[PDB]
Amino acid sequence: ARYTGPVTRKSRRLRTDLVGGDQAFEKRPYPPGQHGRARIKESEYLLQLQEKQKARFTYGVMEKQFRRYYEEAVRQPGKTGEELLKILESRLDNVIYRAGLARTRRMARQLVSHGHFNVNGVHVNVPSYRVSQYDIVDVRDKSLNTVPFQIARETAGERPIPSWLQVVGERQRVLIHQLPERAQIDVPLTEQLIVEYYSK
Amino acid sequence: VKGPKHTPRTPKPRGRRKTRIGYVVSDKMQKTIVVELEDRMRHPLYGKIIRTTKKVKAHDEDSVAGIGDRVSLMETRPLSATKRWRLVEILEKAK
Amino acid sequence: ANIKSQQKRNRTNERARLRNKAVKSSLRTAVRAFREAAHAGDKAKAAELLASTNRKLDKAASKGVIHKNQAANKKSALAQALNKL
Amino acid sequence: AVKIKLTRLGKIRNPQYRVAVADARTRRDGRAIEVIGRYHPKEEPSLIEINSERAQYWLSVGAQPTEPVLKLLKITGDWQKFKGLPGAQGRLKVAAPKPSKLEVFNAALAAAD
RNA sequence: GCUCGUAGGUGGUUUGUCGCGUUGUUCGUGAAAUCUCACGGCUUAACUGUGAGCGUGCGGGCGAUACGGGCAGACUAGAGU
RNA sequence: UUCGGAGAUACUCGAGUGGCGAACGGGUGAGUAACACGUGGGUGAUCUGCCCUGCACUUCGGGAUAAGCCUGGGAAACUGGGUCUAAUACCGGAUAGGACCACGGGAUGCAUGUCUUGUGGUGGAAAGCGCUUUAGCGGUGUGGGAUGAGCCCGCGGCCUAUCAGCUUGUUGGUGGGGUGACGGCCUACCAAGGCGACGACGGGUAGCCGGCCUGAGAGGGUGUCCGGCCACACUGGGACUGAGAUACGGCCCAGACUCCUACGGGAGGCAGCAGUGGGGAAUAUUGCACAAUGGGCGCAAGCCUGAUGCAGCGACGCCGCGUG
Ligand SMILES: [Mg+2]
Ligand SMILES: [Mg+2]
Ligand SMILES: [Mg+2]
Ligand SMILES: [Mg+2]
Ligand SMILES: [Mg+2]
Ligand SMILES: [Mg+2]
Ligand SMILES: [Mg+2]
Ligand SMILES: [Mg+2]
Ligand SMILES: [Mg+2]
Ligand SMILES: [Mg+2]
Ligand SMILES: [Mg+2]
Ligand SMILES: [Mg+2]
Ligand SMILES: [Mg+2]
Ligand SMILES: [Mg+2]
Ligand SMILES: [Mg+2]
Ligand SMILES: [Mg+2]
Ligand SMILES: [Mg+2]
Ligand SMILES: [Mg+2]
Ligand SMILES: [Mg+2]
Ligand SMILES: [Mg+2]
Ligand SMILES: [Mg+2]
Ligand SMILES: [Mg+2]
Ligand SMILES: [Mg+2]
Ligand SMILES: [Mg+2]
Ligand SMILES: [Mg+2]
Numbered sequence: 097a098r099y100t101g102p103v104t105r106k107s108r109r110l111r112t113d114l115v116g117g118d119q120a121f122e123k124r125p126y127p128p129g130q131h132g133r134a135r136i137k138e139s140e141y142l143l144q145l146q147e148k149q150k151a152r153f154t155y156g157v158m159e160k161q162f163r164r165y166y167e168e169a170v171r172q173p174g175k176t177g178e179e180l181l182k183i184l185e186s187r188l189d190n191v192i193y194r195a196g197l198a199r200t201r202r203m204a205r206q207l208v209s210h211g212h213f214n215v216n217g218v219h220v221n222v223p224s225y226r227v228s229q230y231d232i233v234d235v236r237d238k239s240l241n242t243v244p245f246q247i248a249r250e251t252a253g254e255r256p257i258p259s260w261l262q263v264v265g266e267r268q269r270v271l272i273h274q275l276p277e278r279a280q281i282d283v284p285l286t287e288q289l290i291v292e293y294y295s296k
Numbered sequence: 297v298k299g300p301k302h303t304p305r306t307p308k309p310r311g312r313r314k315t316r317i318g319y320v321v322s323d324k325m326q327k328t329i330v331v332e333l334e335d336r337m338r339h340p341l342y343g344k345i346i347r348t349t350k351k352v353k354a355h356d357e358d359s360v361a362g363i364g365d366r367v368s369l370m371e372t373r374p375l376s377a378t379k380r381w382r383l384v385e386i387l388e389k390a391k
Numbered sequence: 392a393n394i395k396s397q398q399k400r401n402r403t404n405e406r407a408r409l410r411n412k413a414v415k416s417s418l419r420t421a422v423r424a425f426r427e428a429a430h431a432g433d434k435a436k437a438a439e440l441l442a443s444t445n446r447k448l449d450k451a452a453s454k455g456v457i458h459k460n461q462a463a464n465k466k467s468a469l470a471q472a473l474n475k476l
Numbered sequence: 477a478v479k480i481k482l483t484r485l486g487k488i489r490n491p492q493y494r495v496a497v498a499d500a501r502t503r504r505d506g507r508a509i510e511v512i513g514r515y516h517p518k519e520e521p522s523l524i525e526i527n528s529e530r531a532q533y534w535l536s537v538g539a540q541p542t543e544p545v546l547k548l549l550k551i552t553g554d555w556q557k558f559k560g561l562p563g564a565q566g567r568l569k570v571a572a573p574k575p576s577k578l579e580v581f582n583a584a585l586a587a588a589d
Numbered sequence: 590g591c592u593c594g595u596a597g598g599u600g601g602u603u604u605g606u607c608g609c610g611u612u613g614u615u616c617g618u619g620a621a622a623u624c625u626c627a628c629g630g631c632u633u634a635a636c637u638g639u640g641a642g643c644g645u646g647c648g649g650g651c652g653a654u655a656c657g658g659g660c661a662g663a664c665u666a667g668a669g670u
Numbered sequence: 671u672u673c674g675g676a677g678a679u680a681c682u683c684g685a686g687u688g689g690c691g692a693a694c695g696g697g698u699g700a701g702u703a704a705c706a707c708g709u710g711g712g713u714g715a716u717c718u719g720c721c722c723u724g725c726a727c728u729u730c731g732g733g734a735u736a737a738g739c740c741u742g743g744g745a746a747a748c749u750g751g752g753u754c755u756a757a758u759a760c761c762g763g764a765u766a767g768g769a770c771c772a773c774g775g776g777a778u779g780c781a782u783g784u785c786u787u788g789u790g791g792u793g794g795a796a797a798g799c800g801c802u803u804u805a806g807c808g809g810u811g812u813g814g815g816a817u818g819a820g821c822c823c824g825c826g827g828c829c830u831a832u833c834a835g836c837u838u839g840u841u842g843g844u845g846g847g848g849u850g851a852c853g854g855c856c857u858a859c860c861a862a863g864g865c866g867a868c869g870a871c872g873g874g875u876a877g878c879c880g881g882c883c884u885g886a887g888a889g890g891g892u893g894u895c896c897g898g899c900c901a902c903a904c905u906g907g908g909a910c911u912g913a914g915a916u917a918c919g920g921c922c923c924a925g926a927c928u929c930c931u932a933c934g935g936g937a938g939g940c941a942g943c944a945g946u947g948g949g950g951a952a953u954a955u956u957g958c959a960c961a962a963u964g965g966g967c968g969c970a971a972g973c974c975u976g977a978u979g980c981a982g983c984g985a986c987g988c989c990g991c992g993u994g
């Protein structure tokens with residue numbers, strides 16, 4: 097399943113603009129609904145819960161899928177917030193967002209879901225495909241000379257590209273240098289209140 | 297018509313039985329002796345070393361063993377319903 | 392029976408039972424004659440009954456009726472029964 | 477009779493196999509005496525490995541191979557080096573290999589500049 | 590309620606010894622799967638292949654003797670006369 | 671050539687004899703508190719078809735009989751008699767040490783001893799068939815492997831003392847018997863023991879384990895899929911055959927239940943797969959295939975395989991993806 101609902105509504109409740117650029121948000125940054133302008137009780141559980149929601153609606157991950165990402169992140173060496181945001185940053189629909197081929201996250205998900213891409217010459221259509229080190233991310237020859245793929249040819253500049261991946265010229269393809277560590281991760285959220293959420 | 301007609305066996309090493317030492321509790325059993333063995337082992341949950349005692353039977357080829365009598369044993373084939381041990385020798389008999 | 396080959400094998404079990412029983416019944420009487428001849432204390436008949444009884448135990452063991460260790464244990468008990476006599 | 481037989485232990489549509497020394501009075505996926513190789517009939521040649529020194533022990537003591545295992549021993553040269561047939565060298569063939577993960581990755585950095 | 594005492598548990602100072610407990614090492618064994626880890630394959634995942642751990646143990650061999658215990662003595666502070 | 675009668679000579683093959691298999695595979699968890707299982711040993715106390723290899727041999731004879739044919743009984747299920755014919759069926763000899771007895775040496779130790787060799791006296795096997803012209807498969811005795819198995823022991827895993835005296839083949843010995851093997855396993859005789867508050871004898875419940883669930887661990891709960899071992903096959907008991915039997919789809923007796931009968935007598939056993947009824951909160955198709963893997967028989971082609979491979983049905987679970 098997906099969410100398939102209003103997107104500004106879950107940025108107002110979480111008090112954080114999750115998509116890139118929104119004029120509906122910042123006219124009302126307070127939570128939606130009819131009791132929205134309240135000064136609410138900030139529980140310790142509320143600060144851990146709403147921090148976990150900030151990552152599910154940034155990346156578009158259901159709860160059972162997001163929990164399995166936590167299962168291996170707590171189980172790998174290093175930290176837990178480092179490795180949870182790493183394996184969320186390695187999903188294919190997030191890689192397409194960081195490379196500039198899509199304006200938002202939800203249009204990055206369809207272009208992977210509708211099968212407009214390859215990775216190692218292999219046709220893929222799964223949005224939670226996790227890329228690894230040295231993975232080329234190619235693109236279908238049918239998907240060239242298409243409107244959403246050529247409307248993102250001239251808009252290659254307004255968003256920055258992170259250091260761990262790289263885009264090239266008119267043969268559009270994305271090269272993964274290594275897995276992203278921490279510093280080149282975009283931060284709307286802290287990474288310790290998610291770890292403290294699953295200890296309850 | 298070349299071979300030796302007797303293939304020699306692969307040398308299998310003679311495995312050993314179990315030898316133990318204990319006192320003597322009974323002797324009135326007509327070429328049979330009763331030996332109280334004992335062994336100590338940890339408790340599985342608490343870790344204290346618990347001392348327990350068994351009572352095995354053994355074969356006297358000649359009835360020379362009385363009460364007391366540190367005796368050495370070696371276990372054998374079944375010799376009766378309950379006898380599985382044989383007397384090897386008596387070291388430091390009943391003082 | 393239901394399976395066709397178990398009707399067949401039911402017939403061959405009885406023929407093997409009658410064959411094994413007549414051999415085993417004659418071995419009892421061969422031993423029994425030796426036990427009476429060794430109870431007479433003769434050592435004349437009991438020398439040559441022992442040679443014919445031990446020959447019959449060998450032939451039963453070659454016909455698969457008794458086992459070869461069963462022939463060995465019964466020959467050794469009749470031969471030692473003569474050495475006491 | 478001691479048999480050298482195959483043991484199905486893959487997925488539903490992926491029959492992986494182990495070359496195992498077993499008894500004939502034994503089901504397929506029971507206790508084998510010893511595993512002496514493997515066989516994956518899903519690669520493009522196949523993926524055949526026999527231990528080939530423990531195979532020479534079990535053949536020299538009387539283990540009869542089944543008919544797929546007998547074909548495998550002829551490919552690996554084990555049945556030929558046991559019976560004395562002249563084809564004792566291994567006529568098995570691996571797939572033509574792929575360029576590795578780094579070599580293709582650098583050849584895209586070489587082509588983009 | 591209080592004491593006496595059976596089995597049992599626990600035991601001062603010191604010499605020598607044994608190597609049962611304990612501890613070191615090595616061999617044999619602890620099936621496969623499952624589980625942990627790392628790579629591979631199913632478009633990804635579940636699933637599955639391989640490698641290494643794990644399998645806390647048990648048996649055999651060879652070292653150590655501080656502590657516990659056994660055996661053979663010494664001691665007087667505890668205990669008793 | 672009959673105009674639907676022929677020719678075993680002949681590939682081929684119903685029924686029959688003979689061989690091998692049918693003890694595996696598949697199922698279930700009633701019984702079982704036990705050497706059942708787990709783990710580690712012992713077997714100088716044992717067996718082991720088929721398979722591999724070393725070494726010997728494959729020699730004379732004989733009497734039947736199923737089938738067939740002809741008849742009798744019986745409602746059936748089945749069964750009687752007379753003739754008739756084979757064999758790798760069966761039976762009897764010759765020679766062949768790993769049977770046996772006595773005496774020997776030689777090595778060996780872990781007490782009974784074991785292993786290897788010597789003399790003397792007793793002994794025990796076999797089977798052929800096929801062949802286009804390198805068609806080829808078999809037989810028996812013994813050495814050694816491999817494999818499967820039996821048996822004994824250490825240790826480990828429930829509750830209950832409002833169960834405290836249990837035990838007479840009981841505990842040990844001797845002589846015989848018995849078994850593949852040790853052994854009160856059985857028997858006679860002699861001794862008077864054995865076990866127990868470290869729970870005997872009773873009672874209650876339970877297949878055990880690899881594991882699974884939980885938990886920071888230590889623990890606690892559990893034994894479902896899959897894999898191992900065990901137990902059973904309507905209830906109870908027994909043996910036969912065989913290398914090997916709890917003999918699911920064998921036998922015999924007894925019992926319950928269902929069915930057939932001419933009332934004299936007979937038949938049956940889904941806890942195999944599928945399915946029906948019933949019980950229940952509740953658990954699926956009277957499916958396809960031997961293409962793969964494993965097994966049985968065969969020189970082989972092949973034949974058999976509800977093992978297995980797959981499909982159907984149920985959101986029953988997990989995982990993944992859509993509904994923009
Ligand atoms: Mg889902
Ligand atoms: Mg037949
Ligand atoms: Mg008579
Ligand atoms: Mg005897
Ligand atoms: Mg009071
Ligand atoms: Mg005391
Ligand atoms: Mg002290
Ligand atoms: Mg003490
Ligand atoms: Mg394992
Ligand atoms: Mg993986
Ligand atoms: Mg992969
Ligand atoms: Mg796996
Ligand atoms: Mg050790
Ligand atoms: Mg004083
Ligand atoms: Mg026929
Ligand atoms: Mg044959
Ligand atoms: Mg069976
Ligand atoms: Mg004739
Ligand atoms: Mg003859
Ligand atoms: Mg002769
Ligand atoms: Mg008596
Ligand atoms: Mg005796
Ligand atoms: Mg006797
Ligand atoms: Mg006796
Ligand atoms: Mg029960």
Ligand SMILES: [Mg+2]
Nearest residue numbers: 885886887889
């Ligand atoms: Mg706790």
Ligand SMILES: [Mg+2]
Nearest residue numbers: 699893894895
């Ligand atoms: Mg089960």
Ligand SMILES: [Mg+2]
Nearest residue numbers: 698699894895
């Ligand atoms: Mg079941």
Ligand SMILES: [Mg+2]
Nearest residue numbers: 904939940941
């Ligand atoms: Mg029933």
Ligand SMILES: [Mg+2]
Nearest residue numbers: 455456911912
């Ligand atoms: Mg028999």
Ligand SMILES: [Mg+2]
Nearest residue numbers: 397692917920
């Ligand atoms: Mg049967």
Ligand SMILES: [Mg+2]
Nearest residue numbers: 918919940942
């Ligand atoms: Mg049935």
Ligand SMILES: [Mg+2]
Nearest residue numbers: 940942943944
């Ligand atoms: Mg059924």
Ligand SMILES: [Mg+2]
Nearest residue numbers: 948949950952
């Ligand atoms: Mg109902």
Ligand SMILES: [Mg+2]
Nearest residue numbers: 960962963975
């Ligand atoms: Mg088949």
Ligand SMILES: [Mg+2]
Nearest residue numbers: 543963964965
């Ligand atoms: Mg086949």
Ligand SMILES: [Mg+2]
Nearest residue numbers: 488980981982
């Ligand atoms: Mg199915």
Ligand SMILES: [Mg+2]
Nearest residue numbers: 984985986987
């Ligand atoms: Mg579904």
